[PDB]
Design a protein around this ligand. Structure first.
Ligand SMILES: Nc1nc2c(ncn2[C@@H]2O[C@H](COP(=O)(O)OP(=O)(O)OP(=O)(O)O)[C@@H](O)[C@H]2O)c(=O)[nH]1
Ligand SMILES: [Mg+2]
Lengths: 271, 817, 82, 81, 82
RNA sequence: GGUUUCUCUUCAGAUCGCAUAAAUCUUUCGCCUUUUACUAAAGAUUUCCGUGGAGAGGAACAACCCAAUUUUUUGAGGCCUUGC
């Protein structure tokens, strides 16, 4: 039935490495701050655009006091990213507004370069420590000479076990991977539902790109968001089957052919 | 659109030595919440949501066992970690007895940890630290175990620096050796103390002593296998400090096998560890696997418990530390003693420092820590507002108690009665309270005093006007506003003369959710909102040339008064209460004379601190031959003080608070036996006098500034600088974070220019930088507020040389006119 | 479970059936107990016996009891403050 | 090593009372106390189950066969535990 | 295998325990430790040839236990899994 | 009593299927010569590709450190006489 795969870590790491050209290098969720779906929803509803995100039909379409200019202090002028970040504050008459604003702590991840280099070493890209401060202070330190001594045997929890293994670094890196690579087992999926390039168009602010393609990125986001907005559950369900009905009836027979051969047969039949 | 043990719960509640109140805190995203989540998972295998940022604090009461199997009752306040919401943390801190601060291992100590340590120490609470997210030193930073030890020690050192900064006595310094420190990872349900980790060694192995081991693990102690005894280093060879040898190395090995292998060798490692897993469990995805395995290895969640039980005093100790600061009487003859014993008895007492809402209805249940005695359902109770004093019967309402509840996280346990030391929700005492309130024996003789109302770490600065779309809906909106005043602690509202309804907040995020609450829940009415603007304060930069002296409305009294600036430190000290008014002239003068070279005579001449009991302004009388008509002077002096207070509360320029100014009297003319004439006429006159001195010689505006901490990669530091340049900011300090590939930027930025700052920063860096900002510092606005030669273009932003004029005029146009 | 009751006044029952009441100050692996201001009772543990509450009471003082001969313990009264 | 045991060793050189498993009561100076509660004493007064007394110069009682010991109150003042 | 582990799982159950000295104990288990030392609450304890006494708390040295009578409801097959 | 894949019946989508189609109706826009075919946002509804849960049936693959003399795995159990 070819559902539910379960692999070893080694398999996963090998597959990951094979896949690298198609894969996003963002380990945190911070890249996508106002480039996520929540922001797009907000943006839609307020009829705003975030500089390189999607535009939209406006959701729908008299003099006032606060508005008056003379009473307004302007140091910095209220940009649309603020309106989306804090849409119940900087924005009158919000409707259908979602709340962006979460802290996805910054992901600090060191790509390893070379096989040597044990999976746990201080990479040059860290920042050296150098604990420096006041005097240490004092603590009821129970000077020896008193008495006492271990009855012997007990030892640190894992002693024969080494700290690290040839797979250790790879195993750790499997922890910070995009979705299909972080798991040993899973359920099999149809090939159609595997959109290899989704994370390419979700990229945040490219620049150096000919106008034409930047528009295409904007349009792909528009499709993305609309699908997410539109996503009713099935809402009602029937398990009716077609090929099982056809196959149970004597007018159909079954076999196995070369795909190519079937294709040819279908074209002839259609003609 | 818990039956069996609650009895058990009640038993625990009764005892008062099995219960403790503790607080989790630390910098944004260091894993406080996942720790609690994972704890709850073990315990019960049975706007915030959408944002992912904690905003409102949550009270959780739970029954937890220590390493010896003794159960306790814990009252845990889970506060928010965003710096804009520190208001709720102060609420928590008033209620509780100690505090747990956990700093994410990979981040280090950050802005809000520093502020919270300061604050909790000043609140006389007991301080412990859980370092969370130790997994990030292994799985993410991939440090060597040796280096992770260094990093951990650095954290400890930094916190000790901070703590020593604000505590007169080093009674407490934190070292896992003393039992003040967790090393944990809530995500993977690993949580231990140096001691409780030793328990693991003993219980798997033989008789070896639990405590003698533990005390010798942390801190440049090495272990010679030949000796069989731990030693100050004598092995030149290079053997990892014993924390590494016995803890971090095997912790790494456990994690490494599970992430790294999990198929090839993981099972045997588990046999060595003594962990049996089933086939199902071993087929799991790696992060859940890690959590599983560590749950088996590392126990229930002991360390938090032991730390709290040993170092937090408990309520029984409770009141005496608590009674001192909180209670206006401060104890002496009756009630202070009563509070201190804490036995349910006598008057009963309560302190309300929160109002947790109910979504469905207008009414909300109040929350507080029962100080003495006990509350029962339906008992009539007497409310004390913060305003009410000893003989102010008017403000003290009474009502009954609908239901009592004990709060698990977002569950409401009904109960019949609640004893002293415990936290409780009270239904029915809602309508008559606003923010802080105390609950007392109702219409029963005794007498009462109210606990000091909440002091906050921050100052509210950002001002928003609010107005409903249809004027006929106004009262609904007003009702809504009342509700949010109860809901949020520092959220301050006011209606200013134009009819403009104003909300003062701490910053953008805060205010956004205040608006959210208001529009979405408390009133369905469509609401207009004005652009964010800050408050300003008013000051003087030089001694007045000449002094205007106002005859009273009755032409009977004259007051000659000048004004000049205070040396910065004075005002800052005045407010902190270090120099505060209560001490006898002898003491006060000694302080000022000693610290600022104040004149003895001038010291003697000090009357009052103006607007607030602790306020920036000072009032002083110096006219020696004429002064020595003190009796007459005395008669009027208090009315002058009241005029002063009122005049500095209210503003000659922008109708704002006057800051950092000394007012000094040179000539007292008072009618012989001033009568009602003097009594009534002088106050209005005095306000005039104050203004006249101020304006004549020599006003300026004060803009509030924020302190900004930015976390960011090396590549984007320049971008941060650029942003601050755009907003008139200026940077203080730019330095890499020890042990982690990021830089920290500290900077300042004017409040007005702070609007949208965060978001522009983050946008220009592609969400790599992140900025926190908190009010920190007031500072004079560059221009001259009073200069009619300056022509203001109506919409175009002005240059700095005359911002003062722009701000002044527009603010006056907004209301003062 | 033992450390909780430490410092409290405790009613301890011996294997012969004696009643030792003292201040529970220390224990160990074997349940050897340290009992301060300890008295021994034989005839009764009073629940307000109208005739008398106390017969064959003996003042002992500072007592170390061996755990071998201990059966059980209940809380008798709170810790003396001293 | 147990906390009560340390307190027992502290009573060495003091006058102590010992009851055995058989209820004989021995009062005198504790010379030596071993880890297992083995007790060497001197200049004893023994009070039997019938009430009668006797006098002994030197005794040694096995730890297991001790029901309990009474120690001076001089010791009461190990409050850490 | 080690059946004390099984007993350690019975916190918050109510049981009747018969002692070696004949005493009968009915109460709610707060804790069993590795030595089978058992701690209870809301305890009605009947020494052989007395009327019951009620104790809020009672702590039994493990060795003095003869046997536990368990709740009829108890799902043993669950508890015997490790 | 355990493990694995076939079949049937029953039930369930409040953030999911870390994916994203088509259709109906009711509105404003945009093509505009008429109708289809269409523009692009909202709302109310369905159909389809997958999916979970429960039961029953059939098949295949295995299979009927810490109790040894000083404490915590008992030397305890039982009987009778005397005393207000
Ligand atoms: N690498 C790693 N990440 C963690 C760990 N624990 C938590 N995190 C992540 O760090 C973030 C912190 O989790 P939270 O518990 O929500 O943080 P917080 O303490 O609630 O911070 P507040 O917003 O102030 O409440 C989450 O997004 C987690 O996914 C950990 O042990 N290791
Ligand atoms: Mg949180």
């Amino acid at each position: 039935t070819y559902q539910r795969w379960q692999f070893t870590l080694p398999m996963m790491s090998t597959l990951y490495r094979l896949a690298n050209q198609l894969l996003t290098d963002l380990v945190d969720d911070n890249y996508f701050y106002l480039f996520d779906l929540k922001a797009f929803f907000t943006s839609k509803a307020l009829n705003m655009a975030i500089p390189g995100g999607p535009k939209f039909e406006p959701l729908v379409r008299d003099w006032n006091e606060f508005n008056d200019i003379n009473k307004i202090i302007i140091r910095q002028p209220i940009r649309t990213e603020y309106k989306i970040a804090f849409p119940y504050l900087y924005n009158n008459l919000p409707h259908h507004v979602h709340l962006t604003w979460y802290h996805t702590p910054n992901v600090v991840f060191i790509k390893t370069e070379d096989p040597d280099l044990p999976a746990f070493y201080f990479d040059p890209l860290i920042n050296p420590i150098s604990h420096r401060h006041s005097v240490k202070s004092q603590e009821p330190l129970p000077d020896d000479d008193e008495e006492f001594e271990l009855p012997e045997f007990v030892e640190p929890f894992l002693k024969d076990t080494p700290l690290y293994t040839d797979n250790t670094a790879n195993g750790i890196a499997l922890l910070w991977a995009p979705r299909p690579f972080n798991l040993r087992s899973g359920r099999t999926r149809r090939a159609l539902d595997i959109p290899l390039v989704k994370n390419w168009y979700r990229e945040h602010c490219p620049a150096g790109q000919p106008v034409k393609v930047r528009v295409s990125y904007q349009k792909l986001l528009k499709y993305y968001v609309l699908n997410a907005l539109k996503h009713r559950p099935p809402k009602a369900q029937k398990k009716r089957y077609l090929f099982r009905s056809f196959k149970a009836t004597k007018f159909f027979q079954s076999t196995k052919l070369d795909w190519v051969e079937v294709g040819l047969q279908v074209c002839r039949q259609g003609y | 659109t818990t039956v069996y043990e609650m009895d058990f719960l009640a038993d625990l509640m009764d005892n008062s030595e099995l219960i403790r109140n503790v607080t989790l805190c630390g910098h944004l995203h260091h894993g406080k919440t996942c720790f609690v989540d994972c704890l709850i998972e073990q315990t019960h295998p049975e706007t915030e949501q959408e944002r992912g940022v904690g905003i409102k604090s949550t009270p959780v009461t739970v029954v937890l066992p220590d390493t010896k199997g003794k159960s306790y009752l814990f009252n845990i306040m889970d506060t928010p970690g965003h710096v804009n919401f520190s208001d709720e943390v102060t609420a928590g801190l008033r209620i509780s007895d100690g505090v747990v601060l956990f700093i994410d291992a990979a981040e280090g100590v950050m802005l809000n940890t520093e502020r919270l340590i300061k604050h909790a120490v000043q609140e006389r609470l007991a301080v412990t630290v859980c370092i969370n997210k130790i997994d990030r030193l292994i799985l993410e930073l991939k440090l060597p175990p040796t280096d992770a030890y260094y990093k951990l020690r650095h954290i400890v050192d930094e916190v000790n620096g901070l703590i020593s900064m604000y505590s007169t006595d080093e009674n407490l310094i934190l070292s896992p050796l003393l039992g003040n420190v967790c090393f944990s990872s809530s995500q993977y349900s690993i949580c231990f103390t140096l001691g409780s980790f030793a328990k693991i060694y003993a219980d798997t192995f033989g008789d070896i002593n639990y405590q003698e081991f533990a005390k010798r693990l942390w801190g440049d102690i090495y272990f010679n296998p030949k000796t069989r005894k731990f030693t100050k280093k004598a092995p030149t060879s290079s053997s990892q400090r014993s924390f590494v040898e016995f803890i971090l190395e095997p912790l790494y090995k456990i994690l490494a096998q599970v992430v790294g292998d999990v198929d090839t060798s993981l099972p045997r490692t588990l046999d060595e560890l003594g962990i049996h897993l089933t086939k199902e469990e071993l087929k799991l995805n790696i992060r859940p696997l890690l959590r599983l395995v560590c749950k088996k290895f590392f126990g229930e969640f002991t360390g938090f418990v032991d730390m709290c039980v040993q170092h937090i005093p408990s309520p029984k100790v409770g009141a005496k530390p608590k009674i001192e600061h909180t209670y206006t009487g401060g104890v002496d003859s009756d009630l202070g003693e009563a509070m201190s014993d804490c036995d349910p008895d006598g008057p009963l007492m309560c302190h309300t420092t929160k109002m947790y809402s109910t979504d469905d209805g207008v009414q909300f249940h109040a929350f507080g820590r029962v100080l003495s005695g006990t509350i029962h359902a339906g008992q009539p109770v007497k409310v004390l507002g913060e305003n009410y004093t000893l003989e102010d019967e008017e403000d003290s309402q009474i009502c009954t108690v609908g239901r009592l509840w004990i709060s698990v996280a977002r569950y409401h346990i009904e109960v019949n009665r609640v004893p002293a030391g415990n936290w409780v929700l009270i239904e029915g005492v809602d309508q008559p309270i606003v923010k802080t309130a105390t609950i007392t024996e109702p219409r029963g003789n005794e007498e009462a005093q109210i606990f000091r109302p909440l002091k906050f770490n921050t100052t509210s600065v950002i001002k928003i006007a609010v107005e409903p779309v249809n004027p006929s809906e106004l009262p609904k909106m007003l009702d809504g506003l009342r509700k949010v005043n109860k809901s949020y602690p520092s959220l301050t509202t006011k209606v200013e003369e134009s009819g403009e309804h104003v909300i003062l907040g701490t910053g953008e995020l805060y205010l956004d959710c205040v608006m959210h609450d208001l529009r979405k829940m408390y009133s369905e009415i469509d609401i207009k909102v004005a652009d964010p603007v800050v408050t300003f304060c008013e000051t003087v930069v030089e001694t007045s040339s000449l002094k205007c002296f106002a005859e009273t409305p009755n032409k009977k009294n004259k007051i000659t008064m000048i004004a000049e600036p205070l040396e910065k430190g004075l005002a800052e000290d005045i407010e902190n209460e270090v120099v505060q008014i209560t001490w006898n002239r002898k003491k006060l003068g000694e302080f000022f004379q000693t610290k600022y070279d104040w004149d003895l005579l001038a010291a003697r001449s000090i009357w009052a601190f103006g607007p607030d009991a602790t306020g920036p302004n000072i009032l002083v009388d110096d006219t020696l031959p004429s002064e020595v008509d003190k009796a007459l002077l005395g008669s009027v002096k208090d009315s002058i003080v009241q005029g002063f207070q009122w005049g500095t509360r209210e503003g000659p320029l922008c109708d704002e608070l006057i800051r950092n100014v000394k007012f000094k009297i040179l000539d007292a003319v008072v009618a012989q036996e001033p009568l009602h004439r003097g009594g009534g006429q002088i106050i209005p006159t005095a306000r005039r006098v104050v203004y006249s001195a101020f304006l004549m010689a020599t006003p300026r505006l004060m803009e509030p500034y924020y302190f900004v901490e930015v976390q960011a990669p090396a590549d984007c530091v320049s971008a941060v600088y650029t942003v601050l340049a755009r907003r008139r900011g200026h940077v203080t300090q730019d330095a890499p974070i020890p042990g982690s590939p990021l830089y920290t930027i500290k900077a300042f930025i004017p409040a007005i220019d702070s609007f949208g700052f965060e978001t522009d920063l983050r946008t220009h860096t592609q969400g790599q930088a992140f900025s926190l900002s908190v009010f920190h510092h007031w500072q004079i606005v560059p221009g001259d507020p009073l200069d009619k030669s300056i022509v203001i273009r109506p919409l175009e932003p002005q240059p700095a040389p005359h911002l003062a004029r722009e701000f002044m005029i527009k603010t006056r146009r907004r209301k003062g006119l | 479970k033992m450390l909780q009751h430490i410092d409290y006044r405790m009613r301890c029952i011996l294997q012969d059936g004696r009643i030792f009441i003292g201040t529970f100050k220390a224990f160990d692996k074997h349940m050897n107990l340290i009992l301060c201001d300890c008295d021994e009772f034989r005839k009764i543990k009073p629940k307000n016996s109208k005739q008398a509450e106390r017969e064959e009471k003996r003042v002992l003082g500072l007592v170390l009891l061996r755990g071998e001969n201990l059966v059980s313990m209940t809380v008798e009264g709170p810790p003396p403050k001293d | 090593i147990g906390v009560p045991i340390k307190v027992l060793h502290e009573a060495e050189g003091h006058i102590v009372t010992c009851e055995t498993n058989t209820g004989e009561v021995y009062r005198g100076k504790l010379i030596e106390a071993e880890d297992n509660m083995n007790c060497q004493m001197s200049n004893i007064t023994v009070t039997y189950r019938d009430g009668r007394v006797a006098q002994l110069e030197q005794v040694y009682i096995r730890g297991s066969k001790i029901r309990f010991l009474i120690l001076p109150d001089m010791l009461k003042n190990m409050l850490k535990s | 295998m080690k059946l004390v582990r099984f007993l350690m799982k019975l916190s918050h159950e109510t049981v009747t325990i018969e002692l070696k000295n004949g005493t009968q104990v009915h109460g709610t288990i707060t804790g069993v430790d590795v030595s089978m030392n058992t701690h209870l609450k809301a305890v009605k304890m009947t020494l052989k040839n007395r009327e019951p006494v009620q104790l809020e708390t009672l702590s039994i040295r493990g060795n003095n236990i003869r046997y536990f009578i368990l709740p009829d409801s108890l799902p043993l097959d669950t508890l015997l899994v490790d």
